[PDB]
Enzyme design. Structure first.
Site, PDB file in Angstrom:
ATOM      1  N   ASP A 167       0.814  -1.216   0.000  1.00 34.66           N
ATOM      2  CA  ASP A 167       0.000   0.000   0.000  1.00 34.66           C
ATOM      3  C   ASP A 167       0.845   1.262   0.000  1.00 34.66           C
ATOM      4  OD1 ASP A 167      -2.637  -1.121   0.004  1.00 34.66           O
ATOM      5  OD2 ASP A 167      -2.318  -1.648   2.130  1.00 34.66           O
ATOM      6  N   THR A 168       0.750   2.060  -1.058  1.00 33.49           N
ATOM      7  CA  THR A 168       1.463   3.322  -1.137  1.00 33.49           C
ATOM      8  C   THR A 168       0.508   4.452  -0.763  1.00 33.49           C
ATOM      9  OG1 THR A 168       1.051   3.491  -3.532  1.00 33.49           O
ATOM     10  CG2 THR A 168       3.270   2.781  -2.843  1.00 33.49           C
ATOM     11  N   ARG A 214      -7.156  -4.819 -13.043  1.00 26.80           N
ATOM     12  CA  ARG A 214      -5.705  -4.632 -12.942  1.00 26.80           C
ATOM     13  C   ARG A 214      -4.981  -5.967 -12.691  1.00 26.80           C
ATOM     14  NH1 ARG A 214      -5.118   0.022  -8.598  1.00 26.80           N
ATOM     15  NH2 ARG A 214      -6.593  -1.391  -7.517  1.00 26.80           N
TER      16      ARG A 214
END
Length: 126
Positions: free
Chosen positions: A34-35, A72
């Site tokens: 998680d960014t 994605r």
């Protein structure tokens, strides 16, 4: 797991990248990270530089589900043999995410990187 070739099209965000994969454009979400986006801009610029400077980008699917509900690709991405997912975490620019749908092969690797960043009070851990 196996690495497959891909070509950069565009860096989108710290955690997403558009690649030509099997000669079609596809968007990939990085496994187990998680960014932000705060370090959001810093995370995105780091991802961007890593992929844009790479001479070789590779995609490695895990053993779990290979696409999310947004279509994605869920993968580990490598630039010049170095894992982008790991690099972000090690740099304190991403936290390790929960395992999604059996995709856990590199979970311990990433947790090790994260522990180290945290011990270094690096970026998000500062």
């Amino acid at each position: 797991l196996h690495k497959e070739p891909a070509t950069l099209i565009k860096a989108i965000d710290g955690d997403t990248v558009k690649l030509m994969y099997k000669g079609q454009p596809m968007t990939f979400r990085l496994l187990l990270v998680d960014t932000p986006e705060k370090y959001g801009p810093e995370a995105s610029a780091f991802k961007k530089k890593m992929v844009e400077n790479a001479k070789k980008i590779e995609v490695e699917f895990d053993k779990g589900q290979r696409t999310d509900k947004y279509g994605r690709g869920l993968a580990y991405i490598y630039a010049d043999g170095k894992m982008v997912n790991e690099a972000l975490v090690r740099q304190g620019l991403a936290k390790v995410a929960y395992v999604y749908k059996g995709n856990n092969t590199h979970e311990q690797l990433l947790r090790k990187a994260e522990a180290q960043a945290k011990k270094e009070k690096l970026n998000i851990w500062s």
